[PDB]
Amino acid sequence: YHEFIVKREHALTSNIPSHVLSKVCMYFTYKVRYTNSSTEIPEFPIAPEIALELLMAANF
Amino acid sequence: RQELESLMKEQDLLETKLRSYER
Amino acid sequence: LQEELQIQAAVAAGDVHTVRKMLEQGYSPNGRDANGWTLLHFSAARGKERCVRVFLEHGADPTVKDLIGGFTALHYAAMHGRARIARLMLESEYRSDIINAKSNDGWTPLHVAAHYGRDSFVRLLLEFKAEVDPLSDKGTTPLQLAIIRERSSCVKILLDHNANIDIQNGFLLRYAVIKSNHSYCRMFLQRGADTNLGRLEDGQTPLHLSALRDDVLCARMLYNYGADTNTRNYEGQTPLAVSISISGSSRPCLDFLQEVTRQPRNLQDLCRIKIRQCIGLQNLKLLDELPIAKVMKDYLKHKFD
Amino acid sequence: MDHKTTFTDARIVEGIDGEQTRPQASPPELPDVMK
C-alpha cells in the first residue's frame, strides 16, 4: 500500500473532492482485477451526478 | 447480408413500377 | 374523341394556350387513360409546367392514384426532379392530401425523391413539412433508399432534417460496415449514431459485422465511439468471437479486438460514454451548453480523433 | 473463491455492518442538459 490508500500496484493505474476520489480508487481495483482476465468485464457504474467531475479527475 | 438483398429488391420494384407506363 | 386527342397533343407539344382555351369551354381536366393517368400525370411526367398550373386552376384533382402502382402526379414529379411542377401542386388546396400520399407499396414522394438523389425536390418536400421518415410497406424510410443508392447529398439533407439515423436499430452503421464505406461510417458516428444496437434478426451489432469483414478501421472507429466489446449476438458470440470463427490470427483486426476486449477502457472515456448517454446522442449540441473547458468538450465530441 | 479514513481480497489481521458485493463496489445538482 476523507482519506484512503491501496496497493501501489493498484494505484499503478495513473495526496478533487471525496465523491470523485472515492471512485477514482474503485476504478484502480476494478481495472487490474479485470485487466488481461478470462471473463466478461462487468460494467463500471458511473452515476450521472458525479460523472462530469470523475471525468475531469481521470487524467488516467 | 440478406438484409441488403431485400432492400435492393424493394428499390428494384420501385424502379420497375414508376417506369412501367412505357413498358 | 377529337378533343381528348387534341388537348393531349397541346400538352405534349407544350401548347398551353390551347389547353386554357378548352378548359374555359367546359372540357374537364379530370378524365383518366387506361393506366389511370390524368392530364396532371401526363403534364408532370413530361415536364410541362405551364400546362400544370392551368389544369389546377380549373379543378384538376392531383390526388388521383394511377392503376399501375397507385402513383400520383406528384410521384412522377418526384421521379424526374420536376420541383417547379411539384411546388405548384404543393401550393394548391390539396397540399396536405398529396404531400405524404403513399403508392400501393407504401412509397411517398419523399421516398421517390430520396431514392433518385433529387436534392432540390427533397428540400422542397421538407420545405412544405413532409414527414421525414414515413414507412414503406417493408418498413423502409426515405433515408434508407437514399443510403442504398448512395445519394450522399440527400443523406446529408435528411439527417439534417432529423431523419432517424438509427432506423431499424443501427442499419446505417450496418450499411457502412457491410460496404466498408468508411466515410459513411465516420460521418454517421460524428452525427451521433448509436453503436450499441443489435439487428433484430440475428442480434449482430456494427462491431460484430466489422469483424465478419476483418475491417480494422471500422472496428476501431466503432470502439473509439463506444461500441461495447462484450455484447453478444443471438448465437452468443462477442465481436471478438466472430473473428475467431475465422481465427488464424495474424491480422490487425483481431489484434485490435483482442487488445480492447480484455483491458477495460479508460475512466476518461467511460465518463464520456455516460455523459453522452445522459445528455442523449442525438442532443449532443447541449454539450456546448456545459460548464467545462474547450479541451474537455473537444474530447467529449470526439473532435480530435 | 474470490473513520475519516478508508480494500483487499479474501481474518481482521490488519497491519495498517463469507458471513457478490465485487471490485467495482456532495455531487452537485447535475446541469440541466443531463436531467
Sign of CA dihedral C63, C65, C66, C70: positive
Interchain CB distance below 8 Å, D24 and A44: yes
D34 at interface of A, judged by CB pairs closer than 8 A: yes
The residue among A16, A33, A38, A53 with the most chain D CBs within 10 A of its CB, best to mutate, is: A33
| C-alpha cell recorded at residue C63 | 390526388
Using the structure block, give the residue that is written with the C-alpha cell 451526478. Answer: A49
CB C202 within 8 A of CB C233: yes
* Structural domain contains residue A20: yes
Q: Give SS3 for C127.
A: helix
* Structural domain contains residue C133: no
CATH number, domain of C220, equals: 1.25.40.20
CB atoms under 10 Å from CB of C29, counted, come to 21
Please tell me whether residues C248 and C174 are part of one structural domain: yes
Q: Residue A57: which of A34, A25, A10 has the closest Cα?
A: A25
Q: Enumerate the residues of chain B whose CB falls inside 8 A of the CB of residue C138.
A: 6-7, 10
Residue of A nearest to C277 (CA): A48
Looking at the complex, report in whole angstroms how far the Cα of residue A35 sits from the nearest Cα belonging to chain C.
Answer: 5
All chains having 3 or more CB pairs closer than 8 angstroms to chain D: A, C
- The two most distant CA atoms of chain D are separated, in Å, by 48
Please tell me whether residues C285 and C298 are part of one structural domain: yes
* Structural domain contains residue A27: yes
* Domain limits for position A22: 8-60
* Structural domain contains residue A25: yes
Residue C192 vs residues C266, C284, C302: alpha-carbon distances, Å: 20, 8, 10
Q: Give SS3 for D31.
A: coil
A49 at interface of C, judged by CB pairs closer than 8 A: no
Interchain CB distance below 8 Å, A46 and C270: yes
Residue A28 vs residues A18, A55, A58, C267, D25: alpha-carbon distances, Å: 16, 14, 11, 9, 12
For chain B, breaks with the C atom over 2.5 A from the next N come after none
Q: How many domains does chain A have?
A: 1
DSSP string across A7-38 = -TTTTT-----HHHHHHHHHHHHHHHHHTT-S
Task: Report the b/e string of B1-23 with b at 16+ CB within 10 A.
Answer: bebeeebeebbeebeebbeebee
CA C115 remoteness from chain centre: 8
Question: Which member of C37, C115, C175 has the closest CB to residue B21?
Answer: C37
Please tell me whether residues C255 and C274 are part of one structural domain: no
Please tell me whether residues C279 and C260 are part of one structural domain: no
Long-range contacts of B8-16 (CB under 8 A, 24+ apart): B8/C148, B10/C105, B10/C136, B10/C138, B10/C140, B11/C115, B11/C145, B11/C148, B11/C149, B13/C105, B14/C105, B14/C107, B14/C111, B14/C112, B14/C115, B14/C145
Terminal alpha carbon distance of chain C: 70
* Structural domain contains residue A2: no
Q: Enumerate the residues of chain B whose CB falls inside 8 A of the CB of residue C115.
A: 11, 14
* Structural domain contains residue C66: no
Please tell me whether residues C178 and C222 are part of one structural domain: yes
Question: Which member of D6, D27, D34 has the closest CB to residue A2?
Answer: D6
* Structural domain contains residue C204: yes
- C-alpha–C-alpha distance, residues C141 and C109, integer Å: 11
Interchain CB distance below 8 Å, B1 and C69: no
* Domain limits for position C277: 266-305
CB A24 within 8 A of CB D27: no
Q: Residue C101: which of C64, C133, C138 has the closest Cα?
A: C64
Q: How many domains does chain C have?
A: 2
* Structural domain contains residue A3: no
Interchain CB distance below 8 Å, D31 and C290: yes
* Structural domain contains residue A35: yes
Looking at the complex, report in whole angstroms how far the Cα of residue C264 sits from the nearest Cα belonging to chain D.
Answer: 12
In C93-235 the beta strands, taken as DSSP E runs, fall at none
Q: Enumerate the residues of chain C whose CB falls inside 8 A of the CB of residue A36.
A: 262-263
Sign of CA dihedral C245, C247, C251, C254: positive
Residue of C nearest to A13 (CA): C266
Looking at the complex, report in whole angstroms how far the Cα of residue C4 sits from the nearest Cα belonging to chain B.
Answer: 19
Please tell me whether residues C233 and C305 are part of one structural domain: no
Sign of CA dihedral C79, C80, C84, C88: negative
* Structural domain contains residue A42: yes
Residue of C nearest to A27 (CA): C267
Q: What is the CA radius of gyration of chain C?
A: 25
Looking at the complex, report in whole angstroms how far the Cα of residue D20 sits from the nearest Cα belonging to chain A.
Answer: 12
CATH number, domain of A31, equals: 3.30.710.10
CATH number, domain of C290, equals: 1.10.750
